[PDB]
Amino acid sequence: VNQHLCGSHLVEALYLVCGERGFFYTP
Amino acid sequence: FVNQHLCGSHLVEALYLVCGERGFFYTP
Amino acid sequence: FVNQHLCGSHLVEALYLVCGERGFFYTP
Amino acid sequence: VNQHLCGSHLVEALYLVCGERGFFYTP
Amino acid sequence: FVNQHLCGSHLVEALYLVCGERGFFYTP
Amino acid sequence: VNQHLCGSHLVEALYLVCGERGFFYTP
Amino acid sequence: GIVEQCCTSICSLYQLENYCN
Amino acid sequence: GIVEQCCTSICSLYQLENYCN
Amino acid sequence: GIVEQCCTSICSLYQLENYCN
Amino acid sequence: GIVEQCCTSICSLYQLENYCN
Amino acid sequence: GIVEQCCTSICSLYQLENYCN
Amino acid sequence: GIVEQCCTSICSLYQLENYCN
Ligand SMILES: [Cl-]
Numbered sequence: 329v330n331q332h333l334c335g336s337h338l339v340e341a342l343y344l345v346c347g348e349r350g351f352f353y354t355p
Numbered sequence: 356f357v358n359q360h361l362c363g364s365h366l367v368e369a370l371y372l373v374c375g376e377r378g379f380f381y382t383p
Numbered sequence: 384f385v386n387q388h389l390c391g392s393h394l395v396e397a398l399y400l401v402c403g404e405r406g407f408f409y410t411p
Numbered sequence: 412v413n414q415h416l417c418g419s420h421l422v423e424a425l426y427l428v429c430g431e432r433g434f435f436y437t438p
Numbered sequence: 439f440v441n442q443h444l445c446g447s448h449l450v451e452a453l454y455l456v457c458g459e460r461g462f463f464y465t466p
Numbered sequence: 467v468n469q470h471l472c473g474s475h476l477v478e479a480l481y482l483v484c485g486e487r488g489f490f491y492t493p
Numbered sequence: 494g495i496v497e498q499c500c501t502s503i504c505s506l507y508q509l510e511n512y513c514n
Numbered sequence: 515g516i517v518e519q520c521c522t523s524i525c526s527l528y529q530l531e532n533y534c535n
Numbered sequence: 536g537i538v539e540q541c542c543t544s545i546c547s548l549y550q551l552e553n554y555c556n
Numbered sequence: 557g558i559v560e561q562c563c564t565s566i567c568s569l570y571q572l573e574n575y576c577n
Numbered sequence: 578g579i580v581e582q583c584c585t586s587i588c589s590l591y592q593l594e595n596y597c598n
Numbered sequence: 599g600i601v602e603q604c605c606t607s608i609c610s611l612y613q614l615e616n617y618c619n
């Protein structure tokens with residue numbers, strides 16, 4: 329669970345830092 | 356513009372939960 | 384429609400924090 | 412704290428998966 | 439009014455991540 | 467990481483409880 | 494309802510407390 | 515796109531599943 | 536409950552769905 | 557501080573309120 | 578203000594950095 | 599990966615940026 333929860337913050341942070349570019353995510 | 360920035364944030368959130376081990380690309 | 388879907392997400396969030404051990408029902 | 416934080420992700424996930432139906436939550 | 443309440447929530451979120459050890463004030 | 471993640475919930479909770487007043491946050 | 498009240502107007506934590514339990 | 519489909523209409527988890535992988 | 540079932544270990548969509556209504 | 561006080565153990569609404577302004 | 582600037586236009590992380598400290 | 603790199607310990611903005619595109 330601790331890493332599923334971290335992942336969720338990670339994508340949110342990616343969403344903002346990546347901008348126009350977007351990003352890719354896989355667990 | 357903002358409307359959609361904020362919706363995008365929820366969308367990534369939802370794709371996170373839904374996609375599972377698949378993962379996903381997101382672009383704006 | 385979307386406006387309210389996204390607001391609902393914040394509302395559950397806020398009800399979570401506010402209700403404490405009470406908990407809550409949410410329906411759209 | 413670790414479970415208060417998990418709860419918060421739980422309700423968000425419930426919000427999406429439950430849809431029209433809605434859900435109930437208690438800690 | 440709501441539009442901006444909900445945007446504020448994302449803004450604090452983003453300021454959290456961006457500011458790092460600086461931290462920040464937020465007022466509505 | 468566990469406290470960076472907690473911080474993020476903290477500011478969100480501050481945002482709501484503080485209202486008009488707003489708040490200050492530093493890690 | 495809560496959506497009708499708090500997605501049109503901003504609801505404080507005291508307003509929201511009335512939808513707990 | 516996903517923004518064009520799901521920021522105008524509400525998208526369920528089944529709709530959203532089509533943008534996974 | 537859900538905190539017991541879904542915080543010590545991941546819940547699928549279907550598992551989470553037991554807590555709808 | 558708040559991270560010290562509210563991350564090792566839950567803070568009530570009133571406890572969190574010490575960090576407003 | 579930040580609400581007036583970043584709730585009307587999208588603000589990047591560099592814009593937002595100017596409201597830190 | 600990112601879960602390996604950024605969940606055991608904080609990632610800077612620049613570190614997170616390796617996962618853009
Ligand atoms: Cl929103």
Ligand SMILES: [Cl-]
Pocket residue numbers: 333334416417471472
């Ligand atoms: Cl968390």
Ligand SMILES: [Zn+2]
Pocket residue numbers: 361365389393444448
């Ligand atoms: Zn939002």
Ligand SMILES: [Zn+2]
Pocket residue numbers: 333337416420471475
């Ligand atoms: Zn979290």
